[PDB]
């Protein structure tokens, strides 16, 4: 590589990797593992236009990579001593997407709505989210609005239900910031056919019958999108051979 | 209060038609899509058919299509559902059932684990062979 390509290489590992590697190696949701990333760290790092990777990106990069929305459109042409690492363009369009969905105020926040769904053999069911209940009962389903993360002093996700031949059962309890993400994440997850913004979740309990909800969120896939942090990996250059 | 009434309901011969209406009130009638369901003894309720009066969309199971239809009439705030070639396998009670028609349009999923917002008391249907 060039000196000019090698030395901006350097400062991204020094500047923004080595720090984003510490702060979240071995921490939920990058390894699925007890303990949770920092929401205000993760929000210093990935923040739209206050952000360290945006701030490098306007230092060092003004001239070959530029703001589309809430993307970042790579242009090389006439500064034919550079090529742009793919994983690297992935990596930065994935942060600014979740920043766009997630961190908006430049703190964790969002709104999305959930809806109970049916199922056989399935007579009540009760998703918690922060302190935030939907108990669905008498087949009597409604939308109903969530912030995450939500103020409390228990945050953390969690499932039970009631099927038509057992008392209330548990199905996941998972406590700390997190806990909606780690919850999203155990069920089986698609576009819901005919909801506008809409994800159908489906959780399959431990007796085999199906916990279903349609999630509706305000701008792209809401809470799914955090999704995409999941065996995340920053990349260790911007410019490759 | 939204009510949603049956009826058409009855005895037809294998290979007839039946026209089962569903009268609706204490709702705003464009607002909503109307679905209809069955339930028949030893099988789970399903979804026979899906309209909206918001969009104009439809939907049916393959276990019907072609042989139901679905129609809206916005004059009397009545949704019909005309059977024809009936099949001992569409035995059931039926229902008509509403729900916000509001950000949603007809496909399985709405009949299937969306959820109904609103339901009437159901009709029987009995095909006679």
């Known amino acids: 590589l060039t000196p000019a390509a090698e030395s901006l290489n350097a400062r991204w590992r020094t500047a923004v990797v080595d720090g984003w590697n510490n702060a979240f190696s071995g921490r939920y949701p990058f390894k699925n593992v007890s303990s949770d990333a920092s929401l205000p760290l993760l929000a210093k790092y990935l923040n739209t236009d206050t952000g360290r990777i945006a701030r490098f990106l306007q230092n060092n990069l003004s001239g070959v990579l530029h703001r589309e929305g809430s993307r970042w459109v790579p242009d090389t042409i006439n500064t034919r001593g550079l090529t742009f690492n793919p994983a690297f363009l992935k990596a930065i369009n994935t942060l600014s997407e979740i920043a766009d969905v997630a961190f908006t105020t430049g703190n964790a926040g969002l709104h999305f709505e959930l809806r109970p769904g049916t199922a056989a053999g399935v007579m009540q069911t009760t998703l918690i989210t922060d302190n935030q209940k939907l108990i669905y009962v008498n087949q009597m389903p409604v939308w109903k609005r969530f912030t995450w993360p939500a103020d409390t002093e228990a945050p953390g996700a969690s499932l039970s239900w009631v099927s038509t031949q057992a008392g209330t059962r548990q199905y996941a309890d998972l406590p700390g910031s997190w806990g909606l993400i780690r919850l999203l994440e155990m069920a089986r997850r698609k576009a819901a056919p005919g909801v506008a913004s809409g994800w159908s979740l489906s959780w399959q309990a431990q007796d085999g019958r199906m916990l279903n909800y349609t999630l509706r969120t305000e701008a792209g896939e809401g809470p799914l999108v955090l999704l995409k942090l999941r065996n995340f990996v920053l990349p260790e250059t911007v410019f490759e051979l | 209060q939204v009510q949603l009434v049956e009826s058409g309901g009855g005895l037809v011969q294998a290979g007839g038609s039946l026209r089962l209406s569903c009268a609706a009130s204490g709702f705003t009638f464009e607002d909503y899509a109307i679905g209809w369901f069955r339930q028949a003894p030893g099988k789970e309720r399903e979804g026979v058919s899906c309209?909206?009066?918001?969009?104009?969309?439809?939907y049916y199971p393959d276990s019907v299509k072609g042989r139901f239809t679905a129609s809206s009439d916005k004059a009397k705030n009545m949704v019909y559902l005309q059977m024809n070639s009936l099949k001992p396998e569409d035995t059931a009670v039926y229902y008509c059932?509403?729900?916000?028609?509001?950000?949603?349009?007809?496909?399985?999923?709405?009949?299937?684990?969306?959820?109904?917002?609103?339901w009437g008391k159901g009709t029987q249907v009995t095909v006679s062979s």
């Open positions: 309209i909206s009066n918001l969009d104009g969309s439809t």
């Open positions: 059932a509403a729900v916000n028609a509001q950000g949603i349009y007809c496909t399985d999923y709405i009949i299937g684990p969306y959820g109904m917002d609103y």
